[PDB]
Design a protein around this ligand. Structure first.
Ligand code: HEM
Ligand code: HEM
Ligand SMILES: NNC(=O)c1ccncc1
Ligand SMILES: [Cl-]
Ligand SMILES: [Cl-]
Ligand code: NA
Ligand code: NA
Lengths: 713, 713
C-alpha cells in the first residue's frame, strides 16, 4: 500500500510527537510504576537472577555453565546506544526489546538472553519493568562472579512502542563508511548526533575501522564514539577491560550459516532470530559476531587476567573460523578453558579493539596503572558501569529502591537538598507583584524563564530550570540566551530575592531557580492582562540552586540549543531544514503538535525571539497574549515570497497593494503550509478561540516550567 | 533517516490502531462537537455561504461570476472517495483537507475552494466542522443556483490527522492498468476494497478506460465504481447528469504548465498547489483536469439542458487545448456562454463519460426517462445527492440540526423507535438466569453476541447488534455466523423472549436485539464464574428489532466478515496476510492494540472460534475466562513449526519430547512474534495479571456490544 511517506518522502513527520499515547499502553491510566517497584521484593528478584546464572537451557546452552557474560553484554548493549548529542538511546526505556534495536546485528543473540529472563519477568509482573530488569540482570551477573557493583536504582518505566530515533541514513546494515549515505566526512568526522561508526553497531567495529585491523586507528574510533556516549579515557578503558574480563565471543563457523534477524524471521520463531544452520546452531557451535575470542583463564570470575594477558604476551593477527580478523598470543600455552569440553584449552586471544588499550599511548598509561593496581581498575569499572547504566535516568529524585548509591556524582547535574520552608501562595503573589514593579518587561521575563526551563530533554531527562544553572557557566554565555540581556535580568531578580529573603523569619527563603520561573509566570500573567484578560499561571516552588562547583561545564555543552524554533533561533546553517529541527525540539520537550503550535504562537507575540527579531511577530500588540500569530498567519489577504538575500526568510505583502506587512522564517510559515499544522493553527486562529488560546498557552507554559520536577512526582 | 518501515517493509503496522489519540487532537478531551453544532446559527452560516457564491477573489476568479459549480465538485469529491467494501473514505471525517486526498490529481484546485471557505470557518469556529462545512457549501451552491435539496444533517466531527487507508499499491499517480502494481486483473476486475480505476481518481477516467475514448466501455467502469460506492444505475445517472448541469471543466493550456500538488509545493504556497505558468494561471486560463467542456447554456442555473444536449446532438471526438479527448456537438451553433468574456460563445461539449449515459443501453433508458420527465430527474438527483453526502454518517441518531429529512430511507439501515418501557436491572438479572438455565453454553452465548455486535465498522458507522439483523437475511446465512448453531440459539432466545414479554404488565417488552447482547453478557459472567471470579458485565438496554423489509440484503453483503481473526476465521485464501487482516478488523472495530490483544485472548478460551476449531485454544479449561491464552502462548517450553499440509497452520510441540501440545494460525502466533504485540501479551500473561485480564476483557467486550449505540450518546 502506497503511503503519504512514499509520495512526499521529505514532508515533516508529526507522528513522532504523538507516540506513547494512552491508546498503545496496556496499563491503566492510573498505573504508577514507581509505586509498583517500591513494593517489589528486590532481594527475591536478585536471588532468582543469581540462580538463573547457572541454570542452562538446552535451546541456548550457557558457556562455561554460566550466563553471566551474556547478560553483561546484554546490559551493556541496552545502555550502549546512548548519545550525549541528543540524549536519545540508552537503557532507560527498555527499547532493546523493540525494533530496530532488537534486530541490530551487534545485538545478535541478545534475543536469547531476553528470553531467558521471561520466567522472572512473568513471576514479578508489573513490579519490575523490562528496562529495570535488563540492567539489574547485568548487576547480578557481575555480583555472582565476584565483582562488587557501585549500586543500582530502579524506576525505568517500560515503554510500549519503538522510539523515533535518527540512527543514520544508510540503507544497508553495517555499511562501511564512504557510501552514498556515509555518516563520515572530512578527516573521519562522524555526523552529529550519531555515536557509532556503522549502522547497527553500538560503538565501533571489533575488527578495526571499516574492518582494517589496526589497533592504533581503532583507538581513535573508540575514543570518539565513547566520548559521544559521555565517557572519557579512564572510563572507556575501565569499561572495555572490565567487560572483557568475562565470557567469550562466538564465531564457530561461517556467518552465512546465520539466518534472519528477529524482525525478519518467520512467525514460528516467536520473536527470536539469527537461527544458525552451523552444526547444533548454539552452544559450542554458536555464531554471534563471527569472532572467536575468550579473554581470560577464568571467564566466569572477576580477575585481573585481562590486563595480565594484554601486557604479558605479544599478539599475532589471525582469523576466526568465520574469517574475521582477531589476535592470538604468540608462543603461549593453552591456558584458556573451553566453554563446553573440559578436556580442551586454548591460547589467549584478543580483539583489535582490545589491543587498542595497549597500543594507543594515552590508553596504555591508564591500562598500565590498572594492571599494576587492580583495585583502582575495580573501582573505576564499578563507577563507570553505574554511570553507563544510569546515564539517562535523570535527576536522582527518580532513583528508586534500597541499592541507590549515596555518593552524589558530578555527572548527575546534582541539585542540593532543600532544607527550609517554601514560599506559599501569598508569598508567590507578593513576589510576582515585586517582579512586575521592578520594570522588567514581559519580553524579558518570558524570555529568561523560557531560556532556563527549555534546556530539558525527555530523552535522558537532563536540563530544565531546577538548579538555576542559567546563571552559571556555560549557560549564562550561550548565544541563544542573550548573555548581556540575561545578566541584567538576573541582577534585578537577585536583588528582589535578597530583599525578600532578608525580610523573612523562620528560615523561609526562595531560591533563584524558583524566582526565575515565578518571574516568567508574572510575565505571562501581565501579557494576559495586557490583552484584557485576568489569569493566574500555576507555580510550584521547591527548586534549588546548584553551584558552579556542582556543574560540569563540558557535559553541559550538549544541552546548548543551537536550533530553537520557539525563539526563532538557528546558530548556524544546517543541512536539516529548520522546521524539522523545530519538531525535534518539540519531541525533546515532550510536546504534542497542538502543544508545540500553541506555545510557539504565544511566544512569538510575547517577545521571546532572540535579538528581538521581528520574524513571525505577527501582531501590532507585542507583549499582549493574543492569538494574533494565527489570525495574521492565516489571512489570505497576505501573499508570501522568499527574499532574494535569504531563501529561508519570507516577506508577507498585502496581495492587493504590495505593501510589506511581515517577515517570517520557515519555522513561522510551516504553520501555514503543513496540512496538519495548518489545521491546528486554524483552531487557534478562529473567532471563538481567544479564551482557548490563553488557557492552552498557560497550560503548556506550566508544563515546560515543570519538566524536570521529579521531586513533585 | 532509515526507519523500521524501510528495514522490514512487510512487518505489521500497529500505528493505524493508535491514530487519533488525545495527543494529536487540539480540542479538550471533553469537547463534544454535537453540542457545539446544536448551538450554531445554521441559518446565519447559510446566508454567509450564499454571499460567498458570487464574491469573486482575484487569486482564483469565479467562473461566470459564481463559485457554485466549483463548490458542488468540491462536495462531490469529499463524499466520492467512499468504498462500500470497508466503509472507508467519504465526507464524514473531512479528510479532503489532509494528505493524500488534498493532493490527489482529481482534487486539483479544490485547495482553492477550501481556502475560499476559511473566512466562514474562522467566523463560526468549533461550532461547524470542516467536514460539515464542505457538504453544507455544496448544498448552498445547489440552492443558490435554483435546485431544492432534500435536506442536510450536521454532526461530522473533524479529525486531525490523515486516516490510514489502502488506496492502492501503485507508485505512480494515475498509472494506467496492467502495471507492476495493477489494481486490475482478469476481465477488468477491480481489486477489493478499491473503488476507483486509477490512483488519484475519485471513480473513473473522464477520457475513458485507461484513456481510451469509448463511451460504452467507460460505462462499464462507471457502473462498477459507482456500485462500489453504494450507487445503482438510477442514482448514478441522476448524480452525473445532475452534477454536470452546472459549471465547467478547466483545460485552457497544456498540463505541463501546472506545478507541484499541495503536499509537494514550497512553504511560500501556504497550503495551496498546482500553480500554473499558463497565461494568468487562473480564471479564463485555468487548468484543472485538462479537459475544456461546458455542458449547458446556463451553467449557474439548474436547467434541463444537460439531457437536451446529450440527446439533441450527435457527437464528434475532438481534443482539448491540453490534448485530452472530449466531444463536440456536430453542426451546433455557439450557444454555450463563456465563463469570462461576454463576447464569446461555444458549441456544446461532453465528456466520454457523459456520453456513457446515452450509449450504454441500460443508462440510455434512464436518461431518456429523465429527459422526458424532468421532475423525476430532479427528485432522483436530490435523493441521490443526500445519500452520496450522508452515506457514511451512520444511524439517523447521529443526524443533527433543523434540516434533517423526516423520511426514513432504506439505505440508512433504519432501526424502529422504541415506544415502550425498557427492562430494568431486576429484569436483566431474571433474563440472564433464564438464559443460563436454558442449557445454552458459554461458547454459544459468546459466539452469538460476538457475531451480532462485531459487524460494526467505525469507517461508515454501519453494522452492530442494534436491529437484531443477525436473525434476518443475509446475516443469518453467513458462514462465519455458523448458521445451524445460530438458528438453534436464536430459537431458544426467542422462546425466552416470548415468555418474558407475555408475562409483562404495561407495555414493557425486551427486544431480541437486547436479549442477544444480554445473553452474551450472561455467557461472559458464567465464564468468569467457571474461573472462580465474581464478575458483573455492564449491559445497556434499548436496542430495537428491525424488519427484513428494513434490511437491504444486497447492501448488507459488504458487512460479511470474510476474515475475522477474533473467531480465527478466514473464508478463503487471500493475498494479504491474515494478521494484517486482523489489524484491519480491529481498526474498523475502533480497538487499540491492547484492546485487540485482550479481546482475542479471551475469545479463544471462551469458545468463540468458528467450527469449534482448536487453533489458538491454548487452555485446558475452555469456557472459563482466564489468561491461559497468554501464559501458554509465551511458554518457551513449546516450539512452533508450520505444518507440511498447510504453511499457515502451526504446531506447538514440547521442546524436550516432541509431543504435540497445540495448533495455531498466523493470527494466533503473531501475538508471540510481533515485538509490540508480544510485549502486550507479556503483560496479560504475567503472574499478577489474572484480575487485570478479566477486568480489561469485560471492558472491551462491553465496548464492542455498544459500538452502534448512538441512541445513548
Ligand atoms: C570497543 C568497545 C567494545 C567492542 C568493540 C566490543 C566487542 C565485543 C564483541 C565483538 C563481542 C562478542 C559478541 C559475540 O560474538 O558473542 C563482545 C562480547 C562481550 N562484550 Fe564487548 N565490546 C566492547 C565493549 C564492551 C563493554 C563496554 C562491555 C561491558 C562493560 C562489554 C562486555 C562484553 C562481554 C561481557 C562480552 C561477552 C559475551 C558473552 O560471554 O556471551 N564489551 N564484545
Ligand atoms: C463518472 C463520474 C464523473 C466524472 C468522470 C466526472 C468528471 C469531471 C471532470 C473531469 C470535471 C472537470 C474538473 C475541472 O477540470 O475543473 C468535472 C467537473 C464537475 N463535476 Fe464531474 N464527474 C463525474 C461525476 C460527478 C458527480 C457525481 C458530480 C456531482 C453530483 C459532479 C459534479 C461536477 C461539477 C459541478 C463540475 C464542475 C466544476 C466547476 O464548475 O469548477 N461530477 N467532473
Ligand atoms: N480508515 N478509517 C477507519 O477505518 C475508521 C474510522 C473511524 N473509526 C473506525 C474505523
Ligand atoms: Cl530513544
Ligand atoms: Cl477514511
Ligand atoms: Na535516552
Ligand atoms: Na468512511
Amino acid at each position: 500500500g502506497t503511503s503519504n511517506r512514499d509520495w512526499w518522502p521529505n514532508q515533516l513527520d508529526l507522528s513522532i510527537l504523538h507516540r506513547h499515547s494512552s491508546l498503545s499502553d496496556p496499563m491503566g491510566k492510573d498505573f504508577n510504576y514507581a509505586q509498583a517497584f517500591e513494593k517489589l521484593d528486590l532481594a527475591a528478584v536478585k536471588r532468582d537472577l543469581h540462580a538463573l546464572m547457572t541454570t542452562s537451557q538446552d535451546w541456548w546452552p550457557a558457556d562455561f555453565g554460566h550466563y553471566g557474560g551474556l547478560f553483561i553484554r546484554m546490559a551493556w548493549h541496552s545502555a550502549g546506544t546512548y548519545r550525549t548529542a541528543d540524549g536519545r538511546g540508552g537503557a532507560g526505556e527498555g527499547q532493546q526489546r523493540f525494533a530496530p534495536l532488537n534486530s541490530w546485528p551487534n545485538n545478535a543473540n541478545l534475543d536469547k538472553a531476553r528470553r531467558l529472563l521471561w520466567p522472572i519477568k512473568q513471576k514479578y509482573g508489573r513490579a519490575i519493568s523490562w528496562a529495570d530488569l535488563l540492567i539489574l540482570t547485568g548487576n547480578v551477573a557481575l555480583e555472582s562472579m565476584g565483582f562488587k557493583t557501585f549500586g543500582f536504582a530502579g524506576g525505568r518505566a517500560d515503554t510500549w512502542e519503538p522510539e523515533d530515533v535518527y540512527w543514520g541514513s544508510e540503507k544497508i546494515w553495517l555499511e562501511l563508511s564512504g557510501g552514498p549515505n556515509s555518516r563520515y566526512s572530512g578527516d573521519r568526522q562522524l555526523e552529529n548526533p550519531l555515536a557509532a561508526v556503522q549502522m547497527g553497531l553500538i560503538y565501533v567495529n571489533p575488527e578495526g575501522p571499516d574492518g582494517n585491523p589496526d589497533p592504533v586507528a581503532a583507538a581513535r574510533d573508540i575514543r570518539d564514539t565513547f566520548a559521544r556516549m559521555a565517557m572519557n579515557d579512564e572510563e572507556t578503558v575501565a569499561l572495555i577491560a572490565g567487560g572483557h574480563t568475562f565470557g567469550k565471543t562466538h564465531g564457530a563457523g561461517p556467518a552465512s550459516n546465520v539466518g534472519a534477524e528477529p524482525e525478519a524471521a518467520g512467525i514460528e520463531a516467536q520473536g527470536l532470530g539469527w537461527k544458525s544452520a552451523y552444526r547444533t546452531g548454539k552452544g559450542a557451535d554458536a555464531i554471534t559476531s563471527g569472532l572467536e575470542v575468550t579473554w581470560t583463564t577464568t571467564p566466569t570470575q572477576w580477575s585481573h587476567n585481562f590486563f595480565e594477558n594484554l601486557f604479558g604476551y605479544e599478539w599475532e593477527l589471525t582469523k576466526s573460523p568465520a574469517g574475521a580478523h582477531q589476535w592470538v598470543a604468540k608462543g603461549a600455552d593453552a591456558v584458556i578453558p573451553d566453554a563446553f569440553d573440559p578436556s580442551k584449552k586454548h591460547r589467549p586471544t584478543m580483539l583489535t579493539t582490545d589491543l587498542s588499550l595497549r597500543f594507543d599511548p594515552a590508553y596504555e598509561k591508564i591500562s598500565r596503572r590498572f594492571h599494576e593496581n587492580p583495585e583502582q581498575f575495580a573501582d573505576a569499572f564499578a563507577r563507570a558501569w553505574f554511570k553507563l547504566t544510569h546515564r539517562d535516568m535523570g535527576p536522582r529524585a527518580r532513583y528508586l529502591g534500597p541499592e541507590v548509591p549515596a555518593e552524589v556524582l558530578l555527572w548527575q547535574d546534582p541539585i542540593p537538598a532543600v532544607d527550609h520552608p517554601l514560599i506559599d501562595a501569598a508569598d508567590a503573589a507578593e513576589l510576582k507583584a515585586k517582579v512586575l514593579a521592578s520594570g522588567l518587561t514581559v519580553s524579558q521575563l518570558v524570555s529568561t524563564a523560557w531560556a532556563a526551563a527549555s534546556t530539558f530533554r525527555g530523552s535522558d531527562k537532563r536540563g530544565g530550570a531546577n538548579g538555576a544553572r542559567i546563571r552559571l557557566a556555560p549557560q549564562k554565555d550561550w548565544e541563544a540566551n542573550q548573555p548581556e540581556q540575561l545578566a541584567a535580568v538576573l541582577e534585578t531578580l537577585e536583588a528582589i530575592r535578597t530583599a525578600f529573603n532578608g525580610a523573612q523569619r523562620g528560615g523561609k527563603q526562595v531560591s533563584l531557580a524558583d524566582l526565575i520561573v515565578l518571574a516568567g509566570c508574572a510575565g505571562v500573567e501581565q501579557a494576559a492582562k495586557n490583552a484584557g484578560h485576568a489569569v493566574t499561571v500555576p507555580f510550584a516552588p521547591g527548586r534549588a540552586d546548584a553551584s558552579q562547583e556542582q556543574t560540569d561545564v563540558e557535559s553541559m555543552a550538549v544541552l546548548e540549543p543551537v536550533a530553537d524554533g520557539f525563539r526563532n533561533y538557528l546558530k548556524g546553517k544546517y543541512r536539516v531544514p529548520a522546521e524539522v529541527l523545530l519538531v525535534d525540539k518539540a519531541q525533546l520537550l515532550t510536546l504534542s503538535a497542538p502543544e508545540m503550535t500553541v506555545l510557539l504562537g504565544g511566544l512569538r507575540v510575547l517577545g521571546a525571539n532572540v535579538g528581538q527579531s521581528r520574524h513571525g511577530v505577527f501582531t501590532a500588540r507585542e507583549q499582549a497574549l493574543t492569538n494574533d500569530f494565527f489570525v495574521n498567519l492565516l489571512d489570505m489577504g497576505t501573499e508570501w515570497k522568499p527574499t532574494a538575500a535569504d531563501a529561508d526568510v519570507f516577506e508577507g505583502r498585502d496581495r492587493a497593494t504590495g505593501e510589506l506587512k511581515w517577515t517570517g522564517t520557515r519555522v513561522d510559515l510551516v504553520f501555514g503550509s503543513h496540512s496538519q499544522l495548518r489545521a491546528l493553527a486554524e483552531v487557534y486562529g478562529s473567532a471563538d478561540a481567544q479564551e482557548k488560546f490563553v488557557r492552552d498557552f498557560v497550560a503548556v507554559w506550566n508544563k515546560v516550567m515543570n519538566l524536570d520536577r521529579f521531586d513533585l512526582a
